[PDB]
Design a protein around this ligand. Structure first.
Ligand SMILES: [Mg+2]
Ligand SMILES: [Zn+2]
Ligand SMILES: [Zn+2]
Lengths: 167, 163
């Protein structure tokens, strides 16, 4: 299986969509990340299933997870990313609002910060418009910066018709 | 041998219940009116009190219902409130999922006082909203066994705990 499909299918990574490798291969989309993660080349090769050009292997795997997360945060602000997250949303992959009166409204992932290492991913309910902590501990080690502070708002700007019927 | 009450409260899914003191149940005046609300009242009460006795199964179900209705009245008394307050301090009922409530402990609450209408929900005194328990193990616990006015009563007696 591809590294991306594998990563996204791991327990705890249910909120991630699979980034189109074509988006990753257009180098301009990754601008700046070359100075934001360790082992940039080896991590990117891993993400793209390229032949690896141990102690180091663990560090490279960690680097790949970080780089993929940062790429993901950018991707979900683009047409493909938004569409894929919208499909996951319709399937309830991110869970449902715990408020009794929101009647299991599906939620969307959101970051309290765009800086890695500041907060773990939270969930935004479009109905009550509040942010919640994931009910499952399997999601408590997923960095919110891989989803971002502006993702839900961008999704609704592009797909206003999904905005809860509570204006 | 373990008491029926300790056995019942220790079962998976019954974590929100406090253990009703026997003396409260032994005072018939506290149980006024319950005989007309559950089947096999006398045998169910004997069972709850560890008193000497398909029918068995139906009586077991009646005892669960009767204990639930007794529990709803008991937790409005100072003793029951104190027991629930201890559980609250330990987080037995869980914490608010709202990020900005900073894991404020919640209390069980019923949306209705009529059995069979709604399962138990959780009330957060910080945001003042009601939530569905995160764990499915609690999704078959009747809210009428906690009641519509329990949280209000607990905070009326112990206002210091209101955020
Ligand atoms: Mg391609
Ligand atoms: Zn909601
Ligand atoms: Zn709250």
């Amino acid at each position: 299986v591809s590294w991306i499909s594998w990563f996204c299918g791991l327990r705890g990574n249910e909120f991630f969509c699979e980034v189109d490798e074509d988006y990753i291969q257009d180098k301009f989309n990754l601008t700046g990340l070359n100075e934001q993660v360790p082992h940039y080349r080896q991590a990117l090769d891993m993400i793209l299933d390229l032949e690896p050009d141990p102690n180091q292997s663990d560090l490279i795997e960690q680097a790949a997870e970080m780089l993929y997360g940062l790429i993901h945060a950018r991707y979900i602000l683009t047409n493909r990313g938004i569409a894929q997250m919208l499909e996951k949303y319709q399937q309830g992959d991110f869970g449902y609002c715990p408020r009794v009166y929101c009647e299991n409204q599906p939620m969307l992932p959101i970051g309290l910060s765009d800086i890695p290492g500041e907060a773990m991913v939270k969930l935004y309910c479009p109905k009550c418009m509040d942010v919640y902590t994931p009910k499952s501990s399997r999601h408590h080690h997923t960095d919110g910066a891989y989803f971002g502070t502006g993702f839900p708002h961008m999704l609704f700007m592009v797909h206003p018709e999904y905005r809860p019927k509570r204006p």
